[PDB]
Amino acid sequence: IPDYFKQSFPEGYSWERSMTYEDGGICIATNDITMEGDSFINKIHFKGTNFPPNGPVMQKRTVGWEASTEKMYERDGVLKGDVKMKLLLKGGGHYRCDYRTTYKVKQKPVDYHFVDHRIEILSHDKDYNKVKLYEHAVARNSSVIKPDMKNKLRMEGNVNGHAFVIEGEGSGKPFEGIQTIDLEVKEGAPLPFAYDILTTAFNRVFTKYP
């Protein structure tokens, strides 16, 4: 399996993602990923709208994302990833969302493969102003990048009219597909919406490819 994300460096890559929730809530996000030495640099823009004021996002009733499988494939020479995601609710149901991502990797001109995800909030303070987040990602069939590397990000976001800024400092194992990050809300505290809707926007370079 080709690893178009690691091959994108040192130059880097970007991605664009739509997230369509089952109750009309919609989020759009972009990330521009560069590398400055031992660290990846993520510049993230996140916008979300049409979340019902009584839905699980605006009432903070989500409990985490279910493990997922993302189908990675090529069309028109562009790398794409689709994954049906499920957000678990405190009452036991699932709140569904369709993710569609365009991965603008190094190679403009490039057999699908999968990426199995597990993402989890390991700890958080009361209002999620500070969050420790973890991801595990592995690709499976149908030396610019050190075994250990830092990952830094800044997100400028607006959800249902509420602006906010979040920055994170973390590290991971690019070749083992493991990473963690410490996230801090820098503007817009306290967030009035479910933190879970942001965590997947907080870098497929941290994926275990054969």
Quick take:
The protein has 210 residues and is mainly β.
Would you kindly provide a written description of the structure presented here, covering whatever features stand out?
The chain has 210 residues and is mainly β. The protein has a single domain, classed as Green fluorescent protein (Green Fluorescent Protein, Beta Barrel), CATH 2.40.155. It has one helix at 196-199; strands spanning 13-21, 26-36, 39-49, 62-65, 68-75, 78-89, 94-104, 113-124, 130-140, 149-159, 162-173, 178-187. It has an eleven-stranded mixed beta barrel. Strand 11 and strand 12 (178-187) form a beta hairpin.
Give the N-terminus to C-terminus distance in angstroms. Answer: 7 Å
The CATH topology name reads Green Fluorescent Protein
* Main β-sheet description: 11 strands, mixed, barrel
Major β-sheet strand ordering: 1-2-3-10-11-12-9-8-5-6-7
Number of strands: 12
Tell me, what is the CATH class?
Answer: Mainly Beta
Instruction: Name the overall outline.
Output: globular
